[PDB]
Amino acid sequence: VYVPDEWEVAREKITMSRELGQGSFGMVYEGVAKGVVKDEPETRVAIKTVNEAASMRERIEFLNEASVMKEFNCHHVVRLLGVVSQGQPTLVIMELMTRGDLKSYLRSLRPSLSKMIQMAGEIADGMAYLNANKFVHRDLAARNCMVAEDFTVKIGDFGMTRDIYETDYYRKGGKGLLPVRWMSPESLKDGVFTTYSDVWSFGVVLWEIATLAEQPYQGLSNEQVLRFVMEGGLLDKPDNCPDMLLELMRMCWQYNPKMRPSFLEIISSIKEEMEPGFREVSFYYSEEN
Amino acid sequence: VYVPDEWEVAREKITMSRELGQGSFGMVYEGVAKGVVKDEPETRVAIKTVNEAASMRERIEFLNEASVMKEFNCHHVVRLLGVVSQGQPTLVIMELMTRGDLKSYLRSLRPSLSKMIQMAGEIADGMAYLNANKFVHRDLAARNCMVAEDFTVKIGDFGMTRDIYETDYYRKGGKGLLPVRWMSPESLKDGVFTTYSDVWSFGVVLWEIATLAEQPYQGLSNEQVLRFVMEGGLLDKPDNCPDMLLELMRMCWQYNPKMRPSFLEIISSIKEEMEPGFREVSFYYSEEN
Ligand SMILES: CN1CCN([C@H]2C[C@@H](c3nc(-c4ccc5ccc(-c6ccccc6)nc5c4)c4c(N)nccn43)C2)CC1
Ligand SMILES: CN1CCN([C@H]2C[C@@H](c3nc(-c4ccc5ccc(-c6ccccc6)nc5c4)c4c(N)nccn43)C2)CC1
Ligand SMILES: [Ca+2]
């Protein structure tokens, strides 16, 4: 059961155009929304839809998982703008990230130390924010980080591990997809995700940044990755990777979860390298922190 | 490992236009293929693609599962026309079914006894053919039957249970999606599919035809369907369903697999109701049979 509230948007206020790609729960479209942002008649938006064909259960979980974003207000986490819970299709309205996902962006360059570090700190800041709001992402990867008009990186789609719904197919136990090349040794073992395993994934994202989105554990099957990582195996250090990002990856990949830095500590160690602008928009320097 | 052969088509001979929907292994497109059919410079075709992002393993299994169709030659099974195994994307070229899948077609009418029976016999004939060629479909459903220009129904996509590959996600054990509302009590129990469980699914297809593609076990969750069917539970008889199709469903849904008719026996019992044309195109009346 979902209860409509102030986040509800009338469908006539929405138009959709081009497909942006299939995320968790369904297709994302570019569109236009009326009356979603302060002091503008209309805003270009991203609209995620749940198919008409989808079960009522998926449709409800879609809305409930998205509704966690009603509490979020961070420059480095993609904002929820509204919801359409009445009629078909069920829609989630979000801040439009016009340069798409970070993985695809990285592939397209196939950056400098200053730009690599700014991305790092932006991602860590969005994550520090979420973790402080008691939220574990569980699917931090470059594919789930997003790039804004001005190249600011923000935290995106967390739904992939929470969407266990396929319309006419059912997996024996009822479990879901797991992002094994981004997961910590302890999460591979028991399937629980924590603040500390998010930090593990952050190191993988830095590695993805440093290799321009190479496939983690490039030469190994999924079964081989499970074994390798659970036995303390680690990703190769990228070519010409600045020492600072190498140092960060290594701290993020401590086998023992309690020995990894927090996100606030990661930012703390690289704050001298950030744009002056970061002090005004980040959660790190905010009153909240 | 896939070994290229006579089914190989040069990529320049292929153009693709509109999306037809995501099947197993990937997106299907309408397109045009040069030199794929006898006595025509070009043929409108369906082209299924495997994404550039997909693993080499998925890409190889795509081709190997599709390659079973190289042995098939039946009017009531969608034909393979060619393969493009060199370069990206990996393509499977097929006979274009211009009215799309049977489920969507059924929804669009929301037929007569004569038309219902012709569909029945066409589907049973394609299935009789596959079963005689030692092939178990494992995913017979109206969504996986296809409608031709002249409204002839043919057997389509068998890949959904064979495609266990997600690019950056991995399901714990390694297993796949199962079509539980179309599966027999014995297949729900041990996950093995047979000739007899295909016949079970055929009854479900007849029910789908008779209800204009209602959802099987409409009011029950997936876990409730498992229990219900394994305890001998059966689908409600459709409103105004002619007795003949009711009789066929019931024979198809005998709890004991060995007590269901074969597909040849199903056709045998309804052959007086088929178009005279059926005798010329069917496997049933063919020399092969
Ligand atoms: C392999 N990947 C497949 C999907 N690809 C597409 C999805 C598309 C996309 N997604 C979003 C977007 C951004 C932030 C989100 C944050 C949360 C959720 C979410 C929704 C429902 C339930 C749970 C989580 N969805 C979100 C969706 C956005 C966005 N905000 N702006 C533009 C494009 N977007 C990028 C990328 C590559
Ligand atoms: C819920 N569903 C989602 C997918 N939807 C779309 C897929 C699209 C489609 N698919 C085909 C087509 C038809 C016959 C096939 C037969 C075999 C395989 C196959 C391919 C690779 C590996 C294993 C099997 N793919 C096949 C694909 C065809 C076709 N031959 N002509 C036109 C459209 N087609 C209809 C329908 C509804
Ligand atoms: Ca889903």
Ligand SMILES: [Ca+2]
């Ligand atoms: Ca797949």
